[PDB]
Write a protein that binds this ligand. Structure first.
Ligand SMILES: CNc1ncnc2ccccc12
Length: 164
C-alpha cells in the first residue's frame, strides 16, 4: 500500500542527489549515510530543520535511472568513522566530511522514461530527470516522482514515521 508512504511525504522537501558513481549509492544503501559538498551540505542542514521530512532522490550520472530515495534523519556531522566513499575526481574526503544519516524509503530503480511527464517548477519546468546535485524539487513534482517508484516491500515505514 501507499498510505504510510504518502503520510511520510506530506509537506516534505525533495532534493535531487546526483551521484557520479554507483559505488557510493550502494554504500549509502548499505550504511544509511550520505555525504555531499559543503554548498549542498548547508542547504540540507537548513532544510532538515524546516520540514517534517527531507527526501533525497538519488540518480547516478549516465545511468538513465533513479536508484531510490531516502529521508534525512539527521544533520551533517564530522569526526565519525571515515566512510570509505569512492571519491570523485576533484573531491576530497575533507569536502565530503559531513555525514547525514538517512533512512531509505525505496531502494528500487525508476528509469527516466517513466518520469517524462514530470517537470520541476524550481528548475525552469525541465523534466525532473534534469538537474545538478542538490537541485530542490517542488512539492507536487517530488511527491509524484516518489509515488512512481515500484514499492519496496523490504522497508517498513513504521520506524520512519516514528522519527517525524
Ligand atoms: C558520497 N558523495 C558523492 N558521491 C558521488 N558523487 C557525488 C557528487 C556530488 C556530491 C557528492 C557525491
Amino acid at each position: 500500500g501507499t498510505s504510510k508512504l504518502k503520510y511520510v511525504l506530506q509537506d516534505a522537501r525533495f532534493f535531487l542527489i546526483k551521484s557520479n558513481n554507483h559505488e557510493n549509492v550502494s554504500l549509502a544503501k548499505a550504511k544509511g549515510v550520505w555525504s555531499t559538498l559543503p554548498v549542498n551540505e548547508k542547504k540540507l542542514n537548513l532544510a532538515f530543520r524546516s520540514a517534517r521530512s527531507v527526501i533525497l532522490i538519488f540518480s547516478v550520472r549516465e545511468s538513465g535511472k533513479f536508484q531510490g530515495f531516502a529521508r534525512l534523519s539527521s544533520e551533517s556531522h564530522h569526526g565519525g568513522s571515515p566512510i570509505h566513499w569512492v571519491l570523485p575526481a576533484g573531491m576530497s574526503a575533507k569536502m565530503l566530511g559531513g555525514v547525514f544519516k538517512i533512512d531509505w524509503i525505496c531502494r528500487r530503480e525508476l528509469p527516466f522514461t517513466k518520469s517524462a511527464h514530470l517537470t520541476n517548477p524550481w528548475n525552469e519546468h525541465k523534466p525532473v530527470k534534469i538537474g545538478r546535485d542538490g537541485q530542490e524539487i517542488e512539492l507536487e513534482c517530488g511527491t509524484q516522482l516518489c509515488l512512481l517508484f515500484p514499492p519496496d516491500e523490504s522497508i517498513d515505514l513504521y520506524q520512519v514515521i516514528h522519527k517525524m
